[PDB]
Amino acid sequence: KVVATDAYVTRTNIFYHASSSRLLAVGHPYFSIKRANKTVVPKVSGYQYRVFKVVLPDPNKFALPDSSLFDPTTQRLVWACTGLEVGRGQPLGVGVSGHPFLNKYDDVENSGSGGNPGQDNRVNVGMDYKQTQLCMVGCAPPLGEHWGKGKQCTNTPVQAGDCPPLELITSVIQDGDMVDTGFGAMNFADLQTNKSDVPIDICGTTCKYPDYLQMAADPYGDRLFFFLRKEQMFARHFFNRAGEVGEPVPDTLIIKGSGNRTSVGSSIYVNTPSGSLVSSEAQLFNKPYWLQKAQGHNNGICWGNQLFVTVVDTTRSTNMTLCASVTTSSTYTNSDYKEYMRHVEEYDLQFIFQLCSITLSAEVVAYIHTMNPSVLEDWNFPDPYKNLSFWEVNLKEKFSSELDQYPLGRKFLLQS
Amino acid sequence: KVVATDAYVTRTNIFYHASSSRLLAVGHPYFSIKRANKTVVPKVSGYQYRVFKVVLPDPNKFALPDSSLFDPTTQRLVWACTGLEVGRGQPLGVGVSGHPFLNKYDDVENSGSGGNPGQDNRVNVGMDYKQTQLCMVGCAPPLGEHWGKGKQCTNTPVQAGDCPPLELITSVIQDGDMVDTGFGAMNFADLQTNKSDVPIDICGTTCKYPDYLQMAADPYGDRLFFFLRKEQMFARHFFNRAGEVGEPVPDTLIIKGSGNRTSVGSSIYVNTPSGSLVSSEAQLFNKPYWLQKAQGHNNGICWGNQLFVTVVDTTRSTNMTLCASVTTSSTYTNSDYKEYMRHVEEYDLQFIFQLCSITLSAEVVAYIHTMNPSVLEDWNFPDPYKNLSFWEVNLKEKFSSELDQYPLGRKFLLQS
Amino acid sequence: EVQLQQSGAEVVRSGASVKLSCTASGFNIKDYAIHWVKQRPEKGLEWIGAIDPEYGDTEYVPKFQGKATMTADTSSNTAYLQLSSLTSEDTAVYYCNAGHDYDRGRFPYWG
C-alpha cells in the first residue's frame, strides 16, 4: 500500500548547495533570565535539542536555468536531500549542572550514616551529565518519548500523596527541549513535586528521548530519513533520598533490628551520572553524510519544501564563568564581585539538494491526496506547526548552483 | 569564480628538502620573568600555540641547475608544499597548572558545606589541563576564535557590576597564544576581573580556539591546506565560585527553606578538566604527512614564498622542577632552598617542496591581481604581519636537491 | 543614585497597627538582603529582621516575633514592615537598610 518515493519521483542531474552560515546561540546554561516580564537572556544549554526548521524555496516558483525540464501541467517539482554536514565550531568540553538544595541524604556508595533524618537535609551538589550525540533528518518533525503523570487512574479510587500513575507520552521534539541526562526521560515538573531531586536545569522541565521504534515503524517514514547516535555514561556516585519511603521494603526481605537502628534507612537509591571522556575520535559532526539509502519509504524527499534537522551535542557543553567587579577594595573581598553563568552554541548547517520532478497521473494524484494532502494544495493542482517552536533556518535566496565554491560542494564533487 | 590552483599552476619534477634543524624553547610554564623592565626568561608552556613562519627562498631568484625550465617573461615560479613532518623531541608527559588563590569554595561533587561565606575563601588548587593535539599548514596565518567583552551594548543602558556582553571575536593566532584549557576559549583578562577564577597561566591572557568553520569556508582557502586534531578531556572535580550570585536561581525552581539554611548556596558551578591518558599510539607527530589533496582551492601553493605551520602539543607538557640551595644547614630547613618552574619544547620542522611554474596570460594576471596582489608586485610583473608574532624559521640557504641525504627525503622516495 | 525612600512619620494611638514602607530595594533578579533596624533613644540600635526579595525569605529576632511582620512585593517596590499592638516602647526611628546584593553585616545603603 505504501511505496517508496523512487517509484513515482524521477531524479535529475541538477544539484544545489545551501549553507546557513554561522549560527550563534548565547545564553544561560541553567535557566532563562526574565526581567521583569519577558526573557532577556535565553536558556542555552548543550543538553538541549537543536531542531532546525530549514525552509526550502519552492522549485515550482524557482528561477531555474531552463523551464523545459518539466511541463507546468501534469508535472511538479520537489527537493530531495542528498548531502548534509552539521558543523560545530566550539572547543570540546563538559559542562556541569547542580542544585543548591539537592535532595541528597547520605553518600551510600561507601557507608554511613547513623541517624540524622530531619527537617531539611538538602545539600548543594553539582554533577556532569551523560554524554549524548545524535542527529536526524526528515521532512516532518521528530517524535520524542517521555514518562509523565499519567491519566488518572488505573484501578481506584483514593488520594493523597501516593505514587502518581506513569504514562509513556509521545510528543513532538521542539527546539530547546532537554535531552535525557542521568535520570531518564520524564516530566520532572509533575513527577517530582519537591523541585529538588534533580539539578535546577531539569527540575522544572521535561527530558525527552527520541522514540526511534515508532518513527522507524511509521508507514511513509517522513520523520527518519536517517539517524546517527552515540550515548555513553557510567555511575559516578551513589546516595539515597531524604523523606518518607512511600513503598517500604517487604517484611519478608529484612530482619528487623536492632536495639538501636530499628528505623529502616531510606531505600530510595539514585546515582549521579557521568559522561566520561569526550574525544575527537567520537565526534559525529564536522564530516559529511550522504543519504545513499533511506530506512523508510521516503528516500529523502523534502515534502512541503521544508526539512527538519535535529541535533544533540553534549561534547561542547562547557559552561563559561564570568566575573564582574562591583568595587575594588584594598584587600580581596568576595562582596566586590558577581559571578555569572554563560553557555554558547555555534552551528553551521550545510546541505546539498537534488531537484526532482513528479509526473502527476491519476494514480499519483490519488496516492498524494492520501498521505499529506497539502502537497497537492500547495502545488495548485493554517500550519499546524505554528504552535511549536523550532530554530528557523531560512535557506531561500541561499541556494547556489556553483557547487565547487563551498566546502560541502567540493566534497560532493569528489565523492558519491 | 574561484578556481583551484591546479588549473593555472603547472607542476614540475623538481623536489627539494628543507629542515629547520633542532629548535629549542626553554622558559617558565606560567608567566614571563621580567627583571627589571624586559623579559629575562620567556613563558614557554605546552598549552601555547607554536605558529612557525617558514620563509622560503624565491624560486625566481633561486640558483636552479638550468634556467631553461621557464621563460623569464610570461612565466613565474612558486613553491608548492608536498611533504611535511613535525618532529617532537621530548618525553611524553602531563604538566600541571594552578593558582595559590583560586576562587574555589566547596567541593560540590560529593556534599558540603554548611555556611562559611566570608571575606576571602580562595584556596591554593592545582590541576592538569585538557589534552589537545593539532597541526595546520597554509600560506596565511590561521584564524582563532574566542569570547571577549563585547561592544556595549545590546539593549540599554546602565551599569554596574552586571554581566559583560559577550562577542565571538575572530583573530589571528600568534606564536605564544594560549590554547583552550578546560574553561573555554575566552578573554579571561576582561571577562573575569577578580584574577582568581582560573589558574595563573591563563588568568591574565586569552585562550583561542581555531575557527575551523571560517577557515574552511574561505574562498581561496589560503589558511587551511590541511589540518589534524585530537582533543580529549573529562570532568575531574566539581566546585562552586565564591562571591555574590549575579543571576540567582529563579524562585520557581527552588522551594525555600529552612529554619536554618535560608541562604541559597553558590549556584555558579565549574569543573576542573583532566587530559586523561597520553600514549604514543595517539601521537600525531614524528610521522610524515603528504598533502595529496587540499580541501580548499589552494592545493598547497606557498604564495609569497612563505609557509605558516601551526602546532599544538600538550602531550609533552611536563614541567621540570628545579631546586637550588641557598645554604646547607646542619639539619634540613626549607629556608635553604629555592624551587623553580621550567618547561622545554623541542621541535624539528621538515618540509619537502615541489617547484611549479605559472604561465601568466592576461586572464591569469587578472585573476592574480585579485586575491593577493602582492604576488604580482613581488614578481616585478609594508608587511601587515609585522605587527603579529610568529616563530621565524628561515629556510633560505637550507634547500637541498639531494633528497636521499635526509630522513624525510628518504621517506619521500619510498612513498607517494 | 542609590537612596531608599520610606513611608513617613506617623503618630499612632496605643493598640493600633502601623505599616512602614521602603523603596528601590527589592527587584526581580536583584536580589538584595533587606534589613530593618529600630533606634530607641535609650537602647541604641536593634536589628529587627532580614528579608530577601526575589526568594522572599524571612528571618526575625525572638524579641520581635509576633510584634513585627515583614512582607515583600517582588515587583517594584518594598519592603513593608508592620507592627501590631503598638506600645510606648515602640516609639522609635525605623530604618530600611540594604547591603549591596546580600548578607547581614553590611549596611552601606540606609533608608
Side-chain angles (χ1 to χ4, degrees):
Chain A
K1 175 155 55 65
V2 184
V3 299
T5 59
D6 308 353
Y8 58 94
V9 180
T10 57
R11 301 273 177 169
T12 66
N13 295 329
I14 320 295
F15 298 94
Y16 281 87
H17 173 275
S19 63
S20 67
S21 294
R22 189 156 67 185
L23 308 177
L24 287 177
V26 183
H28 196 294
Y30 296 154
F31 46 81
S32 60
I33 301 175
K34 300 183 297 182
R35 69 168 84 179
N37 314 115
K38 202 181 185 302
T39 71
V40 180
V41 176
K43 177 181 177 184
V44 177
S45 175
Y47 307 99
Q48 290 179 318
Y49 283 89
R50 288 291 154 248
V51 188
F52 301 94
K53 178 181 173 180
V54 171
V55 185
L56 307 179
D58 192 0
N60 306 278
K61 306 174 182 178
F62 193 72
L64 284 178
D66 208 334
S67 62
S68 180
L69 300 170
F70 75 108
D71 192 306
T73 60
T74 70
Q75 283 188 317
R76 285 294 185 270
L77 300 179
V78 66
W79 293 107
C81 182
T82 57
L84 163 76
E85 180 166 341
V86 181
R88 300 292 271 97
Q90 283 301 305
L92 279 70
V94 181
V96 289
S97 301
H99 196 331
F101 301 111
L102 187 64
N103 186 14
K104 178 182 190 201
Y105 183 76
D106 275 330
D107 194 333
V108 86
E109 181 182 13
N110 190 358
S111 52
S113 175
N116 303 122
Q119 191 157 13
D120 188 6
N121 286 97
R122 297 181 295 178
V123 197
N124 183 15
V125 177
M127 72 198 65
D128 72 311
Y129 287 148
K130 142 188 170 182
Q131 177 185 339
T132 302
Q133 291 181 90
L134 74 94
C135 83
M136 310 175 191
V137 168
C139 62
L143 289 201
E145 60 180 351
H146 73 269
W147 294 96
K149 188 180 187 303
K151 53 178 67 172
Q152 54 193 138
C153 188
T154 292
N155 304 7
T156 48
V158 80
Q159 292 83 358
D162 297 283
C163 182
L166 289 182
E167 176 181 337
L168 184 63
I169 302 177
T170 56
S171 63
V172 183
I173 294 181
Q174 300 178 163
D175 178 74
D177 292 352
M178 299 299 301
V179 78
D180 74 304
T181 37
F183 315 95
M186 45 182 292
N187 192 339
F188 298 97
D190 304 337
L191 299 177
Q192 294 179 351
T193 63
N194 70 328
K195 292 288 178 293
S196 299
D197 284 0
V198 287
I200 62 178
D201 59 347
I202 57 177
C203 74
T205 59
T206 302
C207 293
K208 295 180 182 180
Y209 186 79
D211 197 338
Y212 300 101
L213 302 181
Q214 177 169 354
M215 290 184 300
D218 278 1
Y220 301 105
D222 291 333
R223 287 162 174 155
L224 278 187
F225 291 171
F226 74 99
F227 74 114
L228 292 175
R229 68 191 167 170
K230 163 154 182 167
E231 307 173 43
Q232 74 179 18
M233 63 154 284
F234 71 95
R236 167 84 74 158
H237 296 329
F238 311 138
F239 54 86
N240 46 7
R241 302 287 198 186
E244 300 139 349
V245 198
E247 300 150 343
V249 250
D251 198 358
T252 70
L253 293 182
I254 64 110
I255 288 166
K256 66 95 157 184
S258 166
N260 190 243
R261 228 150 296 189
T262 334
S263 288
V264 162
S266 178
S267 58
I268 308 104
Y269 307 89
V270 55
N271 56 336
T272 47
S274 181
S276 181
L277 229 173
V278 291
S279 63
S280 302
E281 303 155 336
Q283 284 295 300
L284 292 180
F285 309 98
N286 294 319
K287 57 181 183 182
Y289 183 88
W290 320 102
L291 304 86
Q292 295 283 359
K293 178 61 178 179
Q295 186 174 358
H297 281 130
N298 193 332
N299 194 15
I301 306 301
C302 311
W303 300 117
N305 305 136
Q306 66 182 3
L307 189 69
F308 284 99
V309 175
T310 312
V311 171
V312 173
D313 185 15
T314 73
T315 60
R316 297 174 169 86
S317 60
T318 290
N319 302 326
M320 297 181 299
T321 287
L322 304 190
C323 180
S325 61
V326 182
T327 330
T328 50
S329 290
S330 53
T331 79
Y332 185 85
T333 50
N334 286 319
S335 61
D336 291 355
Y337 303 99
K338 298 187 182 187
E339 297 285 350
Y340 299 89
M341 296 285 298
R342 284 298 181 269
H343 182 55
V344 295
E345 291 283 330
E346 177 171 340
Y347 288 80
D348 189 359
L349 304 178
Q350 304 174 69
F351 307 87
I352 288 180
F353 300 102
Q354 177 180 9
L355 182 58
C356 297
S357 65
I358 300 178
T359 299
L360 298 177
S361 70
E363 302 200 292
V364 178
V365 170
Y367 178 81
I368 300 185
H369 189 258
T370 58
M371 195 187 172
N372 288 334
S374 60
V375 181
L376 286 175
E377 299 191 6
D378 299 329
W379 284 346
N380 291 330
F381 195 106
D383 184 20
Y385 304 112
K386 289 181 177 179
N387 296 334
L388 317 175
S389 60
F390 310 104
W391 193 329
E392 302 284 338
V393 180
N394 192 346
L395 283 194
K396 310 193 242 73
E397 308 280 341
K398 283 292 192 54
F399 272 50
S400 177
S401 58
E402 303 169 346
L403 301 188
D404 66 329
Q405 300 299 289
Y406 303 102
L408 187 61
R410 284 169 252 158
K411 297 180 185 183
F412 173 77
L413 302 181
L414 312 177
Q415 219 171 341
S416 186
Chain B
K1 175 154 55 65
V2 184
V3 299
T5 59
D6 309 352
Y8 57 94
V9 180
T10 57
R11 301 273 177 169
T12 66
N13 295 329
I14 321 295
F15 297 94
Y16 281 87
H17 173 275
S19 63
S20 66
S21 294
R22 189 156 67 185
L23 308 177
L24 287 177
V26 184
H28 197 295
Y30 296 154
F31 47 83
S32 60
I33 300 175
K34 300 184 297 182
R35 71 168 85 178
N37 314 115
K38 201 181 185 302
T39 71
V40 180
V41 176
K43 177 182 177 184
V44 176
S45 176
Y47 306 99
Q48 289 180 318
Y49 283 89
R50 287 290 155 248
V51 188
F52 302 94
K53 178 181 174 180
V54 171
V55 184
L56 307 179
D58 191 0
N60 305 278
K61 308 172 183 177
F62 193 72
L64 284 178
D66 208 334
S67 62
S68 180
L69 300 170
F70 76 108
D71 192 306
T73 61
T74 70
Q75 283 188 317
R76 285 294 185 270
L77 301 179
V78 66
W79 294 107
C81 182
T82 57
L84 163 77
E85 180 167 341
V86 181
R88 302 293 270 97
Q90 284 301 305
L92 279 70
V94 181
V96 288
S97 301
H99 197 331
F101 301 111
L102 187 64
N103 186 15
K104 178 260 180 186
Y105 184 76
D106 275 330
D107 194 333
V108 86
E109 181 183 13
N110 191 358
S111 52
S113 175
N116 303 122
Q119 190 159 13
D120 188 6
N121 286 96
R122 297 180 295 178
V123 197
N124 182 15
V125 177
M127 71 198 65
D128 71 311
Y129 287 147
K130 141 188 170 182
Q131 176 185 339
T132 302
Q133 291 181 90
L134 74 94
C135 83
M136 310 175 190
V137 168
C139 62
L143 289 201
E145 60 179 351
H146 73 270
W147 294 97
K149 189 179 187 303
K151 53 178 67 172
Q152 54 193 138
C153 188
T154 292
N155 304 7
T156 48
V158 80
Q159 292 84 358
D162 297 283
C163 181
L166 289 182
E167 176 180 337
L168 184 63
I169 302 176
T170 56
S171 63
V172 183
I173 294 181
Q174 303 181 353
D175 179 74
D177 291 352
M178 300 299 301
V179 78
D180 75 303
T181 38
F183 314 87
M186 45 181 293
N187 192 339
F188 298 97
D190 304 337
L191 299 176
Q192 294 179 350
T193 63
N194 69 328
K195 292 288 178 293
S196 299
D197 284 1
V198 288
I200 62 178
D201 60 347
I202 56 177
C203 74
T205 59
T206 302
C207 294
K208 295 180 182 180
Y209 186 79
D211 197 338
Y212 299 102
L213 301 181
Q214 177 170 354
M215 290 184 299
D218 190 15
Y220 301 106
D222 292 333
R223 288 161 174 155
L224 278 187
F225 290 170
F226 75 99
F227 69 104
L228 292 175
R229 69 191 167 169
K230 163 153 182 167
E231 308 172 43
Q232 69 175 218
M233 63 155 284
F234 71 95
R236 167 84 74 158
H237 295 328
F238 312 139
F239 54 86
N240 46 7
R241 303 288 197 187
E244 299 141 349
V245 203
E247 299 151 343
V249 185
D251 191 0
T252 67
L253 295 183
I254 64 113
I255 287 167
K256 65 253 159 78
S258 167
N260 190 244
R261 229 149 296 189
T262 334
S263 287
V264 192
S266 178
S267 57
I268 308 104
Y269 307 90
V270 55
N271 56 336
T272 47
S274 180
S276 182
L277 228 171
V278 291
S279 63
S280 302
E281 303 155 336
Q283 282 294 300
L284 292 180
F285 310 98
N286 294 319
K287 57 181 183 182
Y289 183 94
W290 319 102
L291 304 87
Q292 296 283 359
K293 177 60 178 179
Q295 186 175 358
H297 280 130
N298 194 331
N299 194 15
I301 306 301
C302 310
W303 300 116
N305 306 136
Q306 65 182 3
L307 189 69
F308 284 99
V309 175
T310 313
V311 171
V312 173
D313 185 15
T314 72
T315 60
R316 297 174 170 86
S317 59
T318 290
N319 302 325
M320 297 181 299
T321 287
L322 304 190
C323 180
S325 61
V326 182
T327 328
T328 50
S329 290
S330 54
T331 334
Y332 185 84
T333 50
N334 285 319
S335 61
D336 291 355
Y337 304 98
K338 296 188 181 187
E339 298 285 350
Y340 299 88
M341 297 285 298
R342 284 298 181 269
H343 182 55
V344 296
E345 292 283 330
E346 178 170 340
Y347 289 79
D348 189 359
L349 304 178
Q350 304 175 69
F351 307 86
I352 288 180
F353 300 102
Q354 177 179 9
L355 181 58
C356 297
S357 65
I358 301 178
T359 299
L360 298 177
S361 70
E363 302 200 293
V364 177
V365 170
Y367 178 81
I368 300 185
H369 189 258
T370 59
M371 195 187 171
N372 288 334
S374 60
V375 182
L376 286 175
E377 298 192 6
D378 299 329
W379 284 346
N380 291 330
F381 195 106
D383 184 20
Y385 303 111
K386 289 181 178 179
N387 296 334
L388 317 175
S389 298
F390 310 104
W391 193 329
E392 303 284 339
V393 179
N394 192 346
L395 282 194
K396 310 193 243 73
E397 309 280 341
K398 282 292 192 54
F399 272 49
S400 177
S401 57
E402 303 169 346
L403 302 188
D404 66 329
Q405 301 299 289
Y406 304 102
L408 187 61
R410 283 169 251 157
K411 298 179 185 183
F412 172 77
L413 302 181
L414 312 177
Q415 220 171 341
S416 186
Chain C
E1 295 177 352
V2 187
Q3 88 286 2
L4 277 57
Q5 315 179 246
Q6 319 217 231
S7 174
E10 258 181 64
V11 190
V12 191
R13 279 210 162 92
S14 180
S17 63
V18 68
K19 206 187 226 309
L20 292 75
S21 64
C22 200
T23 314
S25 288
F27 306 113
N28 343 10
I29 226 60
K30 303 296 170 81
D31 179 22
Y32 286 10
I34 306 179
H35 304 253
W36 285 85
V37 179
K38 172 185 175 182
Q39 183 171 15
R40 179 73 169 84
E42 293 186 356
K43 298 182 178 181
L45 296 193
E46 289 182 324
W47 180 66
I48 302 181
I51 327 295
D52 166 270
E54 169 114 80
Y55 293 108
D57 288 314
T58 57
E59 305 292 344
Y60 297 99
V61 172
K63 297 182 181 180
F64 284 25
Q65 278 173 320
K67 166 74 67 176
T69 310
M70 291 290 326
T71 49
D73 183 275
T74 163
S75 172
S76 17
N77 203 274
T78 232
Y80 302 51
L81 157 67
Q82 80 173 101
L83 304 91
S84 303
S85 61
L86 283 178
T87 67
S88 185
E89 292 189 334
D90 291 326
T91 71
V93 182
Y94 296 83
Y95 295 93
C96 153
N97 47 41
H100 97 78
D101 301 14
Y102 176 57
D103 219 344
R104 31 196 173 215
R106 291 186 61 261
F107 305 147
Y109 308 100
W110 289 65

